[PDB]
Amino acid sequence: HGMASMTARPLSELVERGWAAALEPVADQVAHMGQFLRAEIAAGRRYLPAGSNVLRAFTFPFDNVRVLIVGQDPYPTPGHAVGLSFSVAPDVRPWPRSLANIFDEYTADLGYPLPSNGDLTPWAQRGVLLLNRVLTVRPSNPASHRGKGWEAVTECAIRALAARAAPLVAILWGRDASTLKPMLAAGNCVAIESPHPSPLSASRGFFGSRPFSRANELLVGMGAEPIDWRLP
Numbered sequence: 001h002g003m004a005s006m007t008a009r010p011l012s013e014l015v016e017r018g019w020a021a022a023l024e025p026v027a028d029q030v031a032h033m034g035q036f037l038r039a040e041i042a043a044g045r046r047y048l049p050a051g052s053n054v055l056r057a058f059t060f061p062f063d064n065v066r067v068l069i070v071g072q073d074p075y076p077t078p079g080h081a082v083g084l085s086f087s088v089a090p091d092v093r094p095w096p097r098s099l100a101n102i103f104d105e106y107t108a109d110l111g112y113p114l115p116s117n118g119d120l121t122p123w124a125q126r127g128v129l130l131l132n133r134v135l136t137v138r139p140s141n142p143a144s145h146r147g148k149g150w151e152a153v154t155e156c157a158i159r160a161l162a163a164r165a166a167p168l169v170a171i172l173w174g175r176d177a178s179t180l181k182p183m184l185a186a187g188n189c190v191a192i193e194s195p196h197p198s199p200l201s202a203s204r205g206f207f208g209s210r211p212f213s214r215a216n217e218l219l220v221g222m223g224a225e226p227i228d229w230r231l232p
């Protein structure tokens with residue numbers, strides 16, 4: 001299911017059942033985004049990630065989400081973006097520098113060995129929502145699909161999470177992410193804020209922030225199951 005299905009089919013056919021219900025208020029908007037992508041392709045432009053990966057974050061159960069890690073836009077380099085924020089396919093090398101920095105902090109914080117590869121699917125399977133605010137990008141043009149309609153979709157998703165009484169920890173990397181705090185506050189969620197892991201900002205406070213262990217301390221304090229962050 002790629003852009004054809006995104007344009008033409010109900011959410012219940014595209015994403016996990018809980019997510020389909022949570023996103024119902026933006027069903028028309030998702031369909032419009034499918035048409036946007038079809039228009040791009042008809043104009044001889046590409047987009048990233050692959051159509052089948054665009055909504056991938058919403059294919060893991062809504063009910064199990066306990067941590068939100070928000071990103072801005074997908075990786076712009078062809079072959080990096082896979083529909084989970086910051087993740088790459090297992091054979092990608094070197095890792096994008098943002099992901100290398102995330103993993104540096106992972107090992108510093110948790111004491112586990114560096115991951116074997118850049119595939120964050122295990123986190124998604126364990127209740128971490130790896131959500132970019134904007135879900136597509138034109139190759140090699142960072143942020144090029146900003147303002148095209150994705151923000152309403154992803155805001156709807158985050159609002160649905162925040163509105164639940166269930167515990168939520170939001171890891172908010174950089175200034176754009178910190179704009180989510182009004183929804184999070186009213187939902188009685190907790191945020192961990194730091195500079196972003198991009199090499200542009202990481203050494204101004206991302207390193208040493210210990211977001212993985214802190215998220216788990218917050219979760220346990222709230223009566224939730226912590227995340228098993230261990231990657232192979």
Ligand SMILES: O=c1cc[nH]c(=S)[nH]1
Pocket residue numbers: 070071072073074075084085086087098132
């Ligand atoms: O998915 C990604 C990858 C890098 N950076 C951001 S903000 N999101």
Ligand SMILES: [Cl-]
Pocket residue numbers: 003004038
């Ligand atoms: Cl189509």
